[PDB]
């Protein structure tokens, strides 16, 4: 019977774009609790997870928890050409795979996309079980500034706590970069349980922050001493886009 209706097509693909950043192949999981998809880089350091609880979907039907593996290259291409604002999105099961259908209000244009898909059994959603002392919440825009001037100076970002401040430095002895973030300059919220410092790939931070485009809502960052970084945003129309970034040395 399987049916998914999400209130906003653009927001839905902000998810899809983020997990299909390096490969166009994707495994979506339909379960009792809703929809979730996951991707890890081949070097294991950047994991991207999308999660959409069912209460957020307008229409949801599944016979049994199932997975779908599909190549989404094409679909991605054509929807970027769907000049659309508020359009809703449907994915209904097809005898052969999927059936994405979008409707534009101003034009009346029902574009239905037929893609082939191999059904399967559910992956298991799991969440690094780890305690992250430092939490700050800010803006995709702020993060994008940081990524871009971090990558200009080096290959690795080093984030640390000081006194009510988050410190971000990158680079080598010649050309260093150093940023200090704090409450209302520009952080929306800040909590530091215990002092902590860690180091991450700039390239990987660049990419996780790239998946935050199309997510305008507050963004939450968390980490700890030689622990991973968690970045997580809730889509306006509902559903969490989350990133996990492995630490170094």
């Amino acid at each position: 019977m399987f049916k998914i209706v999400y209130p906003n097509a653009k927001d839905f693909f902000s998810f899809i774009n983020s997990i299909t950043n390096v490969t166009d192949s994707i495994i979506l999981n339909f379960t009792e609790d809703g929809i979730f998809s996951r991707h890890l880089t081949e070097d294991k350091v950047l994991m991207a997870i999308m999660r959409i609880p069912k209460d957020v979907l307008s229409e949801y039907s599944i016979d049994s928890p199932t997975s779908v593996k599909l190549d989404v290259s094409s679909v991605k291409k054509i929807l970027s050409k769907a000049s659309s604002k508020k359009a809703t999105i449907e994915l209904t099961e097809t005898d052969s795979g999927l059936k994405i259908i979008i409707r534009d209000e101003k034009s009346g244009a029902k574009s239905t996309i037929y893609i082939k898909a191999e059904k399967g059994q559910v992956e298991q959603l799991t969440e690094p079980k780890v305690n992250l002392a430092v939490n700050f919440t800010t803006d995709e825009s702020v993060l994008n500034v940081i990524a871009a001037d971090v990558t200009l100076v080096g290959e690795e970002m080093r984030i640390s706590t000081e006194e009510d401040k988050i410190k971000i430095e990158a680079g080598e002895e010649g050309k260093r970069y150093v940023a200090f973030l704090m409450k209302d300059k520009p952080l929306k919220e800040l909590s530091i349980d215990t002092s902590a410092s860690s180091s991450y790939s700039a390239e990987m931070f660049k990419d996780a922050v790239k998946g935050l485009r199309g997510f305008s809502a507050p963004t939450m960052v968390s980490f700890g001493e030689n622990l991973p970084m968690k970045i997580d945003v809730e889509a306006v129309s509902g559903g969490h886009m989350i990133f996990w970034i492995a630490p170094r040395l």
Partner: protein, 243 residues
């Protein structure tokens, strides 16, 4: 002879479609109209333009004047304007066209007139199995969407709906229906289905900025015709041959 049109952008939009279809063209300035007719490089598609004198702020044309031009070049000069700005075209002799683009600054172009070999295109009068009216934006979105996966755009015609679709390894179908409110007007006389070059349809997409709706007409073993009905009375018609 001298004309003044109050918004060069409008003219930009037509010439852009033209420039993608052809290297050189001629705007015929006539007594009660400015006309342009051009078969594309490869002689598959015909574009026809008619700009009634009622559209122009100033209009002084006594006798037919042929303004032959490098389409791509005329493109450049029309692009100079970014806000709404008037275009002034004049001529004193057969050899020279003087174009003025008026904004906060007045940009004059003294262009040497091109003599472009123009062939007699035989005249149409084709009956269409189907002609339907949908939104230009919609038609742009539609073609843009489909072209992304195919260079053969299938156009399908039915008693209640028109589909713009792809049928290759990807399947995409963009529907405009009566009940959807997408299909504004439907002149039906037979089921139709035919394919059309996507790149020719892409050349032409600038034309959608000319009107809120595009009248689209076609039929089995017949050419696709886009008709753009402009305010003021202007007319741009695009005639594409099939596969």
């Amino acid at each position: 002879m001298k004309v003044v049109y109050d918004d060069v952008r409008v003219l930009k939009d037509i010439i852009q479609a033209l420039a993608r279809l052809v290297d050189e063209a001629v705007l015929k300035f006539k007594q009660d109209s400015v006309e342009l007719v051009a078969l594309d490089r490869a002689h598959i598609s015909l574009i026809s333009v008619n700009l009634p004198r009622e559209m122009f702020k100033e209009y002084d044309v006594n006798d037919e004047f042929k303004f032959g031009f490098n389409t791509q070049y005329l493109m450049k000069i029309l692009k100079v304007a970014k806000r709404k700005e008037a275009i002034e075209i004049a001529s004193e002799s057969p050899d020279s066209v003087i174009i003025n683009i008026i904004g906060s600054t007045n940009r004059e172009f003294n262009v040497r007139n091109l003599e472009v070999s123009e062939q007699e295109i035989p005249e149409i009068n084709l009956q269409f199995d189907i002609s339907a009216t949908i939104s230009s934006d919609g038609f742009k979105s539609a073609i843009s969407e489909v072209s992304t996966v195919t260079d053969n755009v299938v156009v399908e015609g039915h008693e209640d709906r028109i589909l713009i679709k792809a049928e290759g390894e990807s399947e995409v179908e963009v529907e405009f229906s009566k009940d959807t409110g997408g299909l504004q007007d439907l002149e039906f006389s037979k089921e139709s289905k035919n394919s059309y070059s996507a790149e020719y349809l892409d050349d032409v997409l600038s034309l959608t900025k000319l009107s809120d709706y595009v009248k689209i007409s076609f039929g089995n073993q017949k050419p696709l015709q886009l008709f753009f009905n402009m305010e003021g009375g202007g007319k741009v018609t695009y005639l594409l041959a099939p596969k």
